[PDB]
Structures are given as C-alpha cells and as structure tokens.
Amino acid sequence: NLNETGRVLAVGDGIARVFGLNNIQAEELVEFSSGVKGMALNLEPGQVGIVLFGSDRLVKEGELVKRTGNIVDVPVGPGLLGRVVDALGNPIDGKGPIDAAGRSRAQVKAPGILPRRSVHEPVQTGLKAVDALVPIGRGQRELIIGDRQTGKTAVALDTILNQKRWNNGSDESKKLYCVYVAVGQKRSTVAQLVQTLEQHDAMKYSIIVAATASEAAPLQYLAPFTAASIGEWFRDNGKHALIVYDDLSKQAVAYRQLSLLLRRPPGREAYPGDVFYLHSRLLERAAKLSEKEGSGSLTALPVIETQGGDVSAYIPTNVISITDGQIFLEAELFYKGIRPAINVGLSVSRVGSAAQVKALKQVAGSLKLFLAQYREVAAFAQFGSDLDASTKQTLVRGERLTQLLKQNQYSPLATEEQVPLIYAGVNGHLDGIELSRIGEFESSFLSYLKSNHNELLTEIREKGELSKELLASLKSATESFVATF
Amino acid sequence: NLNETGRVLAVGDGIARVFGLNNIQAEELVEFSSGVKGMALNLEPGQVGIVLFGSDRLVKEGELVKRTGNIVDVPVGPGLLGRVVDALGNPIDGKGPIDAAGRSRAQVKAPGILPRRSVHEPVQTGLKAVDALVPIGRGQRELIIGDRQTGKTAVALDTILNQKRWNNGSDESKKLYCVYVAVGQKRSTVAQLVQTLEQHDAMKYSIIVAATASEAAPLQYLAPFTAASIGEWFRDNGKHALIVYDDLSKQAVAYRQLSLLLRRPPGREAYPGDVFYLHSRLLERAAKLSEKEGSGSLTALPVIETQGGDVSAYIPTNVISITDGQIFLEAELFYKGIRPAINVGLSVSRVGSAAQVKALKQVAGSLKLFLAQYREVAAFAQFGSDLDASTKQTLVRGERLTQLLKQNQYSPLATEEQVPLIYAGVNGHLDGIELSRIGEFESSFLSYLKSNHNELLTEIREKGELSKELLASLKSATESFVATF
Amino acid sequence: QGYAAEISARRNAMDNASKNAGDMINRYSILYNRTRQAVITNELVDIITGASSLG
Amino acid sequence: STPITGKVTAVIGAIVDVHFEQSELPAILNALEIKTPQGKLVLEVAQHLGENTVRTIAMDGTEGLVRGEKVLDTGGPISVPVGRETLGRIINVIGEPIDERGPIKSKLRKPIHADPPSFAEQSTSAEILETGIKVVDLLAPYARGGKIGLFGGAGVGKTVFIQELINNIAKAHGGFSVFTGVGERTREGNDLYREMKETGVINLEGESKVALVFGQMNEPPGARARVALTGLTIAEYFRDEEGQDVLLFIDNIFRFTQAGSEVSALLGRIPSAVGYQPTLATDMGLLQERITTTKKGSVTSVQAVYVPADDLTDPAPATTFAHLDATTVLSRGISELGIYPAVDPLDSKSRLLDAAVVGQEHYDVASKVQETLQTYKSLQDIIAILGMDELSEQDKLTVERARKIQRFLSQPFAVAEVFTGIPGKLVRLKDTVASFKAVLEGKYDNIPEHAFYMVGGIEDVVAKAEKLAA
Ligand SMILES: Nc1ncnc2c1ncn2[C@@H]1O[C@H](COP(=O)(O)OP(=O)(O)OP(=O)(O)O)[C@@H](O)[C@H]1O
Ligand SMILES: Nc1ncnc2c1ncn2[C@@H]1O[C@H](COP(=O)(O)OP(=O)(O)OP(=O)(O)O)[C@@H](O)[C@H]1O
Ligand SMILES: Nc1ncnc2c1ncn2[C@@H]1O[C@H](COP(=O)(O)OP(=O)(O)O)[C@@H](O)[C@H]1O
Ligand SMILES: [Mg+2]
Ligand SMILES: [Mg+2]
Ligand SMILES: [Mg+2]
C-alpha cells in the first residue's frame, strides 16, 4: 500500500526509522509485524522516525509496519481505583480486565483562563509541619523538591493515607482520590509502595500508574500524561483528585534519551528546547474548575531530585518556576532528628492561608514568626549562658516548637488533633516541660482530651473555627493538664 | 590488483585516505612510495584511514601504497640494554644495529588470572619517605601523580639509580632492569637524562624509548605499548623489570589527535571514548607471574600531569582507578621545604606492608598513622592556644619525623641506612635535638655506624629482619651516640 | 579593670573580622558565578561537538 | 546444519560492520562468530543501518580482521553455561572456560539476554541479614535477598569490604554464590581464586559452592559491557530452575556504564550530559531489574559502585541509588582519619531501618548514635575556633562520647589483617547493639578513646583499656 503501511529502513537504540505511511498522523501509534508497538514523533519528507515501547530485538530491517489511526489514548474512570496499570493503561496486578467509563487522549489542553477559581479548599496532608506551615490547596501545584533519601515520598505518601478520614465518608465534595505515578522506579519498590497502602487500607481510593526503569523510555514519557487524564476525569465530573508525580526528574531523563537518539538539537545538559514545554503542559492541567464548570479540582505534587542541593540546575529551575510552592527537604535536617526534614526557611506556598483551615490558621499565623526569629538566633544557642534573657526566650520556644513538628512516619493527625498541640506550643505551656519529654507529651495530651474534653475536639472538627469561648475552654483544659503533669 | 596495493585519495595532518587495500588487516603496518610508513586504524569500504609516522609533505594524491602483512611489532631482548630506541625499536643513539633475540607485537594480551602471584618482593626506591610509607612491590603499578615542576620524574629516576646495588651482582633473581619511556618530552631533556644515568653507571641496565614531541602523533601513541613489550621480555624469562611511563597524560593527547583527525567522534574534552581502555590495557600488562611461568615480574611507575592541582580531572581519575596506589606530589609542600614533596595524606600503597621490607616494617608500624596525627595536631595548634604535654610531645616528634624524611635528589639510601634513622625517629631520640640539627645528624649518625657499629648494619642487610639480639645492640648503639656530643 | 579592657578589645576584634570575612564572601560569591557559568558552557561544548560530527 | 554466512565490511575500534544478504538479517542482540587462527572473535549485533548492513560490537581484540572475512551467524544471543556444572570454575564473557580445566559440561545453555521478571512475580521480604560489621548491622543492616550497594571513591575500601562479606556469609550460606569481576585489576581475581581454595569454598578435586565470572579491565569495551550479564545469567538459573538462595557479588558495577560510554560515540549516539550516553537510565535499568528476588527463589546481591572524582552527583552513581535497598556509602574524608571501614553513618541508610523490623530497642539506639555524630560534626566550627572549654556541660559530655562511638565503629577485618596487623574480629548484632547502648548511657565515660579504636566486641574495649594502663 505505502500509505497505510511502511518498511523498516533502519532500527536501533530503541528507535526504528520506517519508510512510507504517507498519511500517518503526528505522535500516532503504529504496529510492527512482531507485535511491539511504537509512536512516530518525527515526520520527515523521506522517512518517519518511530520510538519503540519494547525491545528493538523484535524489530528487523524491511519488516512491515501498519497504522493504528489513533493517538496515544488511555482508559479513564472510577474502575481504575484499586488497580495498578502501566503507562498505556493495561493491568499488571492480575485482577482481571479493567472497567473504564471511556478514554481520554494522553495530550489534553489545560483549562482556559476563564473556567477556574481561586483555590479555597484545603488539602489536609496530616503533616503538622505542612498543614501548619505550608498549606496545600485543591488545585494547587506544590512541589516536593529535595536531595536523595530526604523524605520526599513520605510527604506525599502520608498525605494519601490521611485521606481515610473523608473517602470512607458519604459526601463526595469532601473526598479525595489519589493517583500515584511511579516513574523510573524498580519493580521491587512499587510492589512495596503498593503493599504499604494496602496494610493501611488506602488502595481503596488510590490509582497506581507504574513505569518501571526496565520499561522503554517512551513509556516513562507518557506515564505522567496518562495518569494526568485519569485524574482529570474526577476533575471534570465535579470531584477532587490528587496526583503525585514521583518523579519528574526521571521523566526528563527518559525524554532526553528519545530526543537525542532522534538526533534533535541538544540544549543545556543535553535537554531539547521543548523540555520546559513538557512540564508546563503537564502541571497546568491541574487546577480548580469554577462553579459553572463543575467546581471540580486536580491537585499536583511533582517530585524533583536535586544533586547536592543544586536548585539552580536546569530541570529543577523549570519545575520550580511552574509550580506554586516548594517543600524543600534537606538530608542534614534529617540527621538531627527533625523528621520530616522540611526546611521551613525555604518551603513556601503562594496560596497560603487561602487553603488552610481557620481552626489552624488562628494558631499558625504566629508559629511562622517565632520559628523565623529562631533561625536568626540559632548561633547563640552554641554559646554560654551569657546570653541575655530576651534572646534566650526565643531559644526556649524554638527548641520545643521544632521538637513538636517532628512526626513519625505513617502517622497522620487530623486538624482536631493539630490545633491543641499548636495552641499549647505557641502560648508557651511547654517551656516549663523538659525538651526530652516533648514526644510523650503529644501522646498523653491527646488521650486526655479524648476522654475529658472530647466535646471541644468535635466542635473544632465540625465548625472548623475557634470562637472566643473555645479559645478560653481550650486554654483552661491545657493549663490543667500541664499543671497535673 | 588493488588487493595488495592502493592509491592515495587525500592526505594531510598526518592522515591519509588511501583507496584499495582490501586484504590489509586491522592496525597493520604499511609503506608508501615516498619511503614513509603508516598505520591503518579505520577500515571502510570506500577508503582506508591511515596515520603517518612521519611528515606528510611527501605523500600526494594518487601515490602507490603497499602493505607489510604484519602487525606493528618491536625488537626485544637483552641487546637493547644500554641502547636508546624509538617507538618502532630502531636505534637513535648511533651505536650500531639493535641485536634483538625475538620480536613481539605492540598490543599484547595481559597475563592470565591463573598465572599470577601475590606481590611479596620489595622495590628499593632508595627514598626513605617512600620505602617507609608507600613501599613498591615487584608486580604492581605505583602512580606518580602531581603538577608540573614538583618532582615526579625525580622519584622514578632515583629508583633506577638505587638498583645499582644489585645489578652489579651475580645473582639474577635479585637484580632489577629499568625501562624509561620518554613521551612528549623534548630531545634536549631526554639527552640530559641519559647523560645523568651514565654519570652514575646506570645506563648499562637501562633501556630508553624516545617519543619526543616533534615526532608524529602515532609514535607518541605507540611508544608506551612497544616499550612495555620490551620489558615484558624479562618478566617471561624469569627476570624482573621496572618500566616507567612519563607520561601517559601526553600519550592521551597524542591518541586524541589521531581520533579527531580520523574524524572519530570525541567523548569528553575531545578525548576518544575508549580513552580509559588506552591505559587499562597498558598497566594490566605488568604483574607478578606464577612460579610455573618463571617467577618473572614487571613493575610500573606511570606518571601523570595535573593542572592547578586538580586530581578530579578526566585522564587522572581514569588512571588512579587502575594503579595500585599513588605518590601524590604537591608544589606547596616543595617550597615549605618538604623535598621530595610527598603528601602522605593522599599517597597510599594498595600492596602495603606486603611489599615493604620486613626489617623496615618493624621500626615503622603506625608511623604513617602518626604523621596523620601530626597534621591533625599541627592544624589545631594554629588557634594560638597553649598545648599540654601530650599534644606538644607528638607535635615535637611529628615535626622532626617530617624533617627526617627530607632527602636530597640523586642520593639513594640503602635499606641498612634507612632502618637506623627511622628507628631513632619513631622512638623519640630526636625529640631532644633542635630541628636545624636533624640535617647533619643523619650523615653523622651513619658515619658513626659505618666506623664502629658496622657489624649490625651487616646483619640487618643480610637477615633483612630484626632479632631479639639485634634490637639489643641496635638499642645501645643509638643511645650511646645521643650521649656523644 | 583589665578584664573590662579585654572584652572591649575582643568586641572590636570580632567586629572587623565579621566585616572582612563578610566582605570576603561577597568576593568569592562572584567567583562562584563565573565558575558556575564556565562549567555550564564547557559541558555544553562537548555536547555540541559530539553532534556536529559529519564527514 | 543451515548456517547464515556474512562478510565484514568495516572495522573501527570495537565496532565491526557486517554485510549479510537479503532476508538473512539477524535480529538485534544476536551473537556472531569469525574463525581465526588464534581463536574466535564473537560479535554482537547492535543496529541495522539498512541495506543489509548490521553494526556489531567486538567481544575481543579487533586487530587481525581482514576487510571481508566471512562471519558465521550464531543464530541467537551469546550463550553461557548454566547449572551446578559451572560451580568452582572460572568463566569469561563468551562462556568459555578460562581455568585450564577442560570443557564445562553443562546440560543447558541459556542466553545472557532476557526480559525482567513481571511485576506479579515480585516478592517483598523484610528479613534482616547478619554480616558481623558493627557500623552496618547497627545503622544500615542488609536485607536477606536484597540489593546492597557499596559506594566510594578510589581507594576507600570497597573491595576489602565486599571481600569480608564473602568471608562471613559465603561459607555460612548453605547455598550457591556467583562472583562477577567487571572492569577490575586482574590480580585481585588471582588472590580471590587463591583464597577460595584455602578457605575450602572451591575444591578442585571436590565440591564447590560458587562460580567465577571475570571480564576485567584489560578487556575491550565490548567485553566489560556484557560481562555483568554473563554472570547474572548463571545466578538467575539457580534462582528459578534451582529455586534456592543465591549470593551475587558484582565488582565493579560502574564499569558496566563506563564501558558502554566508550563505544556509544562510535555507534552514532549524541553524547548526553557529562559525556555519558543517553541510554544510561535504561541500560542501568535492564540490569538491576533482572537482579532481584522472585517467588521462585531468593537472591542476595552485593554490588560495589564506583564514584568518579568522589562526586555523588555523577549520573552513574546517582542513578544506581534507586535500584538499591541498602546503601553503604564510603567517604574518603573518613579514610584519612584512620578510621575504617570508612563508612559514612549519616549518608548510609537502609530499608530494614525500621522499628517493626530490627526491633524498637534497636531503632532507638541507632537513632541516638546518629544524632550524637551529627551534633559533633555541627560543633566542628566551635571546637577549632573557640576550643573545647567553651562548649556547655551537655555539649562536652556529648562530644567526648561522639568521639568514642566514632572510633568504636572501626573494626579489624580478617581480610585486611595484613594492613592493620590486628586479627580480624566478627561482632554479633545482638552484642553490637548492647555495646553502643551501654556507651550511650555513659557507663564508660572513664575509659580512654584509644580503647575504642580498632576494637571488636565491647568486652575488648574494657580489656584494651586495662592492657594500656600497664
Ligand atoms: N517522617 C518520617 N519519620 C521517620 N522516618 C522517615 C520519615 N520519612 C522518611 N523516613 C525514612 O526515609 C527513608 C526513605 O525516605 P524517602 O523515601 O521519604 O525519601 P525519597 O524522597 O523517597 O528518596 P529517594 O529519592 O531515594 O526515594 C526510610 O528508610 C524511612 O526510614
Ligand atoms: N629531592 C629533591 N630535592 C630538591 N630539589 C629537587 C628534588 N627533586 C627534584 N628537585 C628539583 O625540582 C626541579 C624539577 O624536578 P622534576 O624534574 O622531578 O619535576 P618533574 O615532575 O619532572 O616536572 P616535569 O615533568 O615538568 O619535568 C628540578 O630543577 C630539581 O632540581
Ligand atoms: N579495614 C581497613 N582498615 C584500614 N584500611 C583499609 C581497610 N580496608 C581497606 N583499607 C585501605 O583501602 C585500600 C584498598 O582500597 P580498595 O578496597 O581497593 O578501595 P576501592 O574500592 O576504592 O578501590 C587498602 O590499601 C587499605 O589501605
Ligand atoms: Mg521516592
Ligand atoms: Mg618530568
Ligand atoms: Mg577496588
């Protein structure tokens, strides 16, 4: 035929150049005699360059190839929940065929300027150092940047687990479906990551798009977009979906590989000029739809791995420029004990209070202050008692306020349990307590309220605010426990 | 017709694309009509890429080309001893034809895994700083990395001079023949070097291979490989050899030149991809052979030239990874008066004490560790704070041990003269002597033993170890001298 | 009285030290730029030279 | 037989181009053979340039190839021997015996190239592995059937380290082991082979429990880039077909990328950032994926990684972290101090570093040790600028301890006994934790620091401190 078919002229490096297909579309899929499929990214006057989704051992010279007449598409809908699929959208867990409610193109245009709303729905991560300091909002793009082995996944992972508080409820505009995008991670890791969510009953509302490192590059290229659509479904239909790209760094590497092999112009660090257009066209897909559009929303938590704190690198600079805040993590802070090691100094959020519970905002507005002055007078802590009383007071707080943020992994706390801890910290009811007993303080204090002041906690959970009556009732209950302690 | 001959298509920069030669082998020697020989490295259907050993102003388009049928080899055997040859093995000293016993190829496979022996035989370098800290062993390759004008060649040169102690002997298994490989150096220098060897009757057991800068790039590239075959000869006939490359840094520059000119894609800093494989298949050729093979051995002292003290460079790292340790030399220590400026902090020997002499092994056990403590205390006394008895005691001794290690060039010291000095150092008999005294002390102490306690020197020499009795006499000989003057 | 004179001098000593050391930072920080840019341009040259390879 | 003939048409370095006939082209990753007077020069298909032309990668010395020699198609990827037949024998990349023991009688021949196990086949474990090294068993303990990584610059202690692990696990393991030397000193192999005989692991006239695969640095870029696969294939066999525990030792794994990095340019690949090839993540990926534990058998892997210029930001090392469960980073800044193995306690992490794995007590003690060593390093700017006296009572007391624990992490290995002069010492995890615990409580604030340097069990500390006093 020559118009719907083509002959392999040359194959290699997981990229084969075919001749023919004079009617093939851009980025369209194709199928080889062997069975392995690919998509043509380069459309030259003579030949057509096509990447492979499988080993190039299957593809030979002169082999026949036929069109598919379809662009990269993936099946979306609520059937995926509790499953584990690859970039294409096939099952890999062995639970049977998937039940999708339709398909969506890998490449979807972001919502326009008009069909959006200022983020206003908080995304409780269950992390004290986060929901208090860097609040995240439904539709926001908060970036989890940090060196290797710092606690980047911990942040997201806990977030998902902290969703059992609403997903097992009845109201929908309150739930939050989680979509994790494994890119460049070995299978062993995914199999474990999945096994953790199950032991916590989180797979009930989580979607895993696995893209192991052994898989072809393009797979690791389409993974983020594939998963992107899946979540947009929820967004379009008027719901809430949280998607975590872990990690975009690996994605760029994959894409760089394809681009170089295809002999496209190499830029800074061997990345083609369209690398930024890649992530910008991905993150902008998540947002907050207006009331007319469905009030639906898609949150994005992209993960970037820096090389020795170098946030000045190419890739990171691109991502950091697009997102709407970072949760910078440092290994050093990790070693001291501060876990999760979230550098309050750098970690920021452009949305801020706009997406934070007023119950916590009333006690967090000041918490950023003390910590701020603490980092400035942190050198004094190393000197003798010759420090004046003024500065010394700061050290007393900081040591304790920093000790409170330390939260064990897999142990998210609801807002009703955060406020009481922050309120006692800010006022300074812990200053008298030893800096060694701060840990057990949280335990015994929470258990106290849930037996004597349970009525207060439940009023904060429902109202979400703190009236002058509660502020006084909470203070009295605290001073009482601190006294008996 | 063209099977054994060919016509030149282009020529320039020492490169010649000849057409024909469809039965020439890979890396085969060839001869042009002009008289100049060449080497085929790139085999292609259209033409063959050949590199010239001489100027190219003689080759012209359409010239005849003939083949040798043999892989580029060099004459080998004892005859070369005392002679100065070039890459190919031709005499350049003007003292008659090279009477060789056999001819071996340039590229030879490294010795087998089976036919090997753990290094146990020392290599007296005559340098106290070396034989005490980083000992050399027959069968290993000890690097000599450092910046320009530091003393790299020095270390090597003195070694050859020290061998006179055994090469004039009757015993063979004790001698050690030396192969200096000048690469990139000017003829002026080489001439002066060979002059110096003769001034010490060290030319008789020394072979020199010259590949000055002026010669063609392919000569500088082939020089080391051919030179190695020369030395391998002794290794196979159950004799010991000592080859010194100076320097591989230039060789890579040369080999870089053939690549670029043959239009071969560069890797990093224009060096060919397999630039590692250039030094790897060179150094591995030197090692200790099995008793079945002859108990023969070949030691290697590769030399590298860093820029601005940057050992993190491309070529140097490539070689540090292969060599059994390195004798780092710093310019800064040279001025301070540490000569040779061997940085113990960075200089190590992987063979370690196994190679060191047993006698010298006893007198200096944690000496290297002690000199580490010295720099630890020397840096901490920078504060300008008073020092107690401990930190000053070690500071006193550590400062003098560094002064004892200083040895003049062209002045190799036997083993029987190193042991005594180090003995009086590690113990603490120099502590009670002024620093500017350590100088003459060495010479005076030696003259003392050679006159009175000479019997001991004779026991240490033969035995090579220290008995319960020898320590007693040696102990008393030291204290008796301290009391004198 | 001679103790009050040490603290007074030591308070001046570390004042100028912070000024010199501080100002020294604003000097090396500039060398960190030119050296950062140099590594970005150099690594870029090998990438271009490896692709500009023709016949 | 019906073999496919071919003819060489180009020879450039380790890259050989063969020109077959129409309809007779071999797929990618197929072996080839060329008869030579000396031996056989196997080639490996790489690309299909077109016009019936294929580009291969020379598995050996390319010198001596004549423009147009006839090549014999193997008809399939490089085949290596498998089975208990390969136990106690040395094998190169091509699968030919190189120990002078005659032919290796194997019932099967399995290709070095194969697909990674299915996500379904992946099996997670949480069992701990006891080696005997304090700094490890206490901080980052290795997992049974897990992947280990030994990072470290040149001359830090990666070889001696991995060698001790063999002297404490291999004998003590009722299963089979596979050592694979990739791009290393041929002499290190020699010593190894000698020790395996002397320890009893390999018996020439008896039974053996380990196979040996070497593709050292003396070999061309072709060999070092596939030797890792050759030994992997022999391990994998005992994994699925034999269905039993297997210890895989790879040293070094960095040569796998490097070797490929040399030829990538000649294969017409635009050099990626830092000079490495674009296909870094995938290649490094298709190797580690295969090295894993399935529901058929367990495989404990100990891969030593090389760090170019003591730089961890380098792609090669950086990429390898994600394929490891337990990472043991070695710092040169620790070597120089004399403390060995120069293991970095903060930078080194583990998967089994969980309370629900190593025990609650174990976690707490380990965490305390880490926090102590951190503050120590944090006060390094005060201990030199203001002295030790300026530090607070709580600080000085901590600092002293941090110095004792630091030196207490050092341990003499029976392998490097020729370096330290002190006899190897193997400490049990049960005693290890009990030792630091005691030191963290201040029960030995009287004992001198030099009593913790190069010492095994905690009892030896007290014994040593008493022997010095004499
Ligand atoms: N909040 C926490 N509390 C206690 N331990 C933690 C916490 N967060 C992370 N960890 C520890 O961190 C380790 C893994 O860290 P994490 O996976 O968060 O980093 P990462 O961003 O995934 O790094 P990598 O890029 O290597 O995956 C585990 O060993 C676990 O012990
Ligand atoms: N042991 C020594 N004591 C005093 N001076 C020395 C010593 N060794 C070398 N020098 C001096 O150092 C200078 C250069 O020494 P050397 O030839 O060893 O350097 P190099 O490493 O060879 O540098 P290049 O490679 O450029 O020749 C000489 O002028 C010599 O006098
Ligand atoms: N347990 C130890 N104690 C002291 N030094 C050691 C120890 N292990 C190794 N070393 C040092 O490291 C050197 C060997 O380094 P090696 O293990 O080859 O490092 P690399 O893996 O970087 O090549 C030895 O010469 C020795 O000096
Ligand atoms: Mg992660
Ligand atoms: Mg010199
Ligand atoms: Mg090593």
Side-chain angles (χ1 to χ4, degrees), chain D residues 291-309:
Chain D
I291 306 182
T292 194
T293 297
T294 61
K295 305 174 176 192
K296 297 183 184 171
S298 180
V299 182
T300 305
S301 179
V302 190
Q303 293 180 309
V305 183
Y306 174 83
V307 186

Side-chain angles (χ1 to χ4, degrees), chain D residues 24-47:
Chain D
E24 300 182 314
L25 297 179
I28 309 285
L29 300 178
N30 285 312
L32 296 175
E33 293 182 315
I34 166 71
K35 170 190 178 296
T36 73
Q38 302 181 300
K40 60 181 175 186
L41 171 63
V42 188
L43 304 173
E44 176 179 313
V45 178
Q47 303 177 298

Side-chain angles (χ1 to χ4, degrees), chain A residues 13 57 192 195 263 335, chain D residues 28 47 124 268 346 351 363:
Chain A
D13 303 311
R57 167 183 180 72
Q192 183 56 47
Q195 172 177 318
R263 301 191 174 293
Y335 305 129
Chain D
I28 309 285
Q47 303 177 298
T124 63
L346 308 176
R351 165 168 173 77
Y363 179 62

Side-chain angles (χ1 to χ4, degrees), chain A residues 127 144 146-155 157-158 180 185 189 246-247 250 303 305 329 334 337-341 406-410, chain D residues 321-322 325 349-354 363:
Chain A
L127 298 177
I144 307 181
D147 295 303
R148 71 191 161 273
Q149 305 181 297
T150 55
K152 291 186 307 299
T153 290
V155 177
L157 184 60
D158 282 320
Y180 186 66
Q185 297 176 304
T189 296
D246 190 56
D247 55 288
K250 301 297 170 68
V303 185
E305 179 177 63
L329 305 183
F334 189 93
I338 314 185
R339 302 164 173 185
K406 292 185 183 180
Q407 177 182 314
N408 298 299
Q409 188 178 34
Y410 302 123
Chain D
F321 284 124
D325 296 302
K349 299 180 177 59
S350 184
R351 165 168 173 77
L352 305 177
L353 183 59
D354 181 42
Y363 179 62

